Structure 1
Amino acid sequence: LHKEPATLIKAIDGDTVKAMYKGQPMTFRLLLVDTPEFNEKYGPEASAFTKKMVENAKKIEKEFDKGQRTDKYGRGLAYIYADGKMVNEALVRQGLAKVAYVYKGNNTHEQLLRKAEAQAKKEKLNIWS
């Protein structure tokens, strides 16, 4: 896969952000992860982690996988990087997201994220506490 530039409009919650994609404001949904909803346990924490990671970055980038680039809701589906660090992976590593929604042909970073999830589980972090 390859990274490409992204233009952040605003973070929304733990696993969605709003981006300007070819001049269209568009929600992007992070691939391979599920954060809690904002008013569920660890919701506000997952939101804040994603928000600070993308807002405080010098650069956001996105990376499409090989399959669907949009979901049934018109959301873009990507891996998002903040100054080269993958937000999807960081959330899982800190126990703020589960690996989830793994579909064949959009699963390039599956094993990387499962390695992070196992470490968060071993450390009993957040969701796994």
Structure 2
Amino acid sequence: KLHKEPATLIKAIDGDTVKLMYKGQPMTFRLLLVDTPETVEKYGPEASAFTKKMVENAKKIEVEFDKGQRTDKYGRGLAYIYADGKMVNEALVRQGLAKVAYVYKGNNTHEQLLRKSEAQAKKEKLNIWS
């Protein structure tokens, strides 16, 4: 089973990338299973503002690595980020500011949860889906 770990926000980079102090070392995390528009694509600065706002306002940030590979080729940590118990990954998708990404190297624990949310956002024609 997965487990959450504390992290401290250092700097939010964009819709799907955040910089945190993980285990005393600063590190960039790439949010698992989400594809936000590049900051400029339509809805890119909105997804960035959202991610940024969600993490800067949180009293507690926690990271959760999946069962697959924990870093990508650029050295970015691959995880689910929690801001005061709320998973940022899911929050983005539910708000229609991100598409569910293809599973990477066995990291699929929350793909169903995210798929559901995305369906709902499509249904409500939210942002990316309007």
TM-score higher than 0.5 here? Answer: yes
Question: Is the 1:13–1:50 Cα contact (8 Å) retained in structure 2?
Answer: yes
Aligned Cα RMSD in Å?
0.9
CA distance in 2, matches of 1:54, 1:22: 18
Following TM superposition, by how much is the alpha carbon of 1:91 offset from its aligned partner in structure 2, in angstroms?
0.2
TM-score (norm 2): 0.96
Question: Is the 2:15–2:37 Cα contact (8 Å) retained in structure 1?
Answer: yes
Following TM superposition, by how much is the alpha carbon of 1:104 offset from its aligned partner in structure 2, in angstroms?
5.0
Runs of 4+ in 1 over 4 A off after TM superposition: none
Write the deviation string for residues 93-116 of structure 1: whole angstroms up to 9, x where unpaired.
Answer: 000010003135210000000000
CA distance in 2, matches of 1:118, 1:101: 15
Determine helix, strand or coil for the equivalent of 2:18.
strand
Following TM superposition, by how much is the alpha carbon of 1:46 offset from its aligned partner in structure 2, in angstroms?
0.1
Following TM superposition, by how much is the alpha carbon of 1:7 offset from its aligned partner in structure 2, in angstroms?
1.3
Q: Percent identity?
A: 96
Aligned length: 129
Question: Is the 2:34–2:93 Cα contact (8 Å) retained in structure 1?
Answer: yes
TM-score (norm 1): 0.97
Write the deviation string for residues 48-105 of structure 1: whole angstroms up to 9, x where unpaired.
Answer: 0000000001100000000111101100000000000000000000000100031352
Question: Is the 1:95–1:128 Cα contact (8 Å) retained in structure 2?
Answer: yes
Following TM superposition, by how much is the alpha carbon of 1:21 offset from its aligned partner in structure 2, in angstroms?
2.0
- Unaligned runs of at least 5 residues, structure 2: none
Determine helix, strand or coil for the equivalent of 2:13.
strand
- Unaligned runs of at least 5 residues, structure 1: none
Question: Is the 2:64–2:79 Cα contact (8 Å) retained in structure 1?
Answer: yes
Question: Is the 1:65–1:107 Cα contact (8 Å) retained in structure 2?
Answer: yes
